[PDB]
Amino acid sequence: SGFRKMAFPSGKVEGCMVQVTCGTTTLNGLWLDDVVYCPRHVICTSEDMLNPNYEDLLIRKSNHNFLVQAGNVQLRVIGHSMQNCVLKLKVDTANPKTPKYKFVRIQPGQTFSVLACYNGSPSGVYQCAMRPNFTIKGSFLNGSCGSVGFNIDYDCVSFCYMHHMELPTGVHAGTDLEGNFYGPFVDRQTAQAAGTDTTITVNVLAWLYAAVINGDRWFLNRFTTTLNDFNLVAMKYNYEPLTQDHVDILGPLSAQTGIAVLDMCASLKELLQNGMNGRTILGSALLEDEFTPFDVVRQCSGVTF
């Protein structure tokens, strides 16, 4: 028992991280087979980033302008191209440590692990959720761009996020591995606002099931509710609507505990309307929404990779 915010093992991704330097800008790249993926602003000076024309900057670069280092080994660049907001550098050596992998575009509410890197070297790993407003609450400093986020399923790494920028209140934004931003953001240092964030209701419910499985049951009440009545209350407290798809996804946890989803909704409604009265759930004084139903099942059942 116990319940912790748990990241995926990072070894398969660590073997893919490299350093990319162009001019005086250095960041991280992802080396898979004979291609290195990295954010396109590696070709910018800090002044260019205020208003960059990336297509124009790239045509003035040649293969040799890109210094790619995998540990202490320089990789020779033999081609380059831009796809949306990422650069693809073809190198003359395929990465022998390439895992089975896919590129995926995750949905808001889904979680992934972030391997934060500097100078092509990994510094730490942590779990994030894609917020409804298409940002993540990460931990990133200068030089962390090109750090990637990922999920693992058996042996296959699903890369879903590449880091590009920071927004007010220490919130982070980036792209999928095809270089398309999550959310209405562009890679330019100019005023841009994220939308209002909301609480991921299905994840809060998943975490309440995690609490019951761990024996923290004080918040279970004797009532049920309708899906429509629950969603009227959730709306007031800035919670996402709960859909029938969400109910079906919570099925395994509901079947394991014998607590119908609509009964857990009745308990969540009371917590929202009355607060926690100074009590905690799984050690937390606030409701947690960065565990998916699958995260809960994985941790409570011991899924390995």
| 67 contributes a contact to ligand P0O by CB under 6 A | no
Q: Which of 15, 23 has the CB closer to ligand P0O?
A: 23
187 binds ligand P0O (CB under 6 A): yes
Instruction: Give the shortest CB-82-to-a second copy separation in angstroms.
Output: 27
Provide, rounded to whole angstroms, the least separation between the CB of residue 101 and ligand P0O: 23
Q: Let me know: does 134 contact 173? Beta carbons within 8 Å.
A: yes
Known catalytic residue at 80: no
> Is 145 an active-site residue?
yes
Contacting range for a second copy; rule: CB under 8 A; set: 12-20, 31-39, 62-70, 178-186: 12-20
Angle between helices 201-213 and 293-301 in degrees, nearest 10: 20
- Determine the Cα–Cα distance for residues 52 and 36; give it in Å rounded to an integer: 22
Q: How far apart are CA 143 and CA 293, in angstroms?
A: 33
Write the interaction track for ligand P0O spanning residues 30-49; mark x where CB under 6 A is met and - where it is not.
-----------x-------x
CA dist., res. 104 & res. 94, Å (int): 22
Tokens 């079906």 belong to residue: 248
238 binds a second copy (CB under 8 A): no
Residues 6+ apart with CB under 8 A from 148: 13, 30, 114, 115, 159, 161, 162, 163, 177
97 to 156, contacts with a second copy by CB under 8 A?
Answer: 115-119, 121-126, 128, 137-144
* Residue 114: CB atoms within 10 Å: 27
Binding positions for a second copy, rule: CB under 8 A = 1-12, 14-15, 115-119, 121-126, 128, 137-144, 166, 170-172, 214-215, 280, 283-286, 298-305
Active site residues: 41, 145
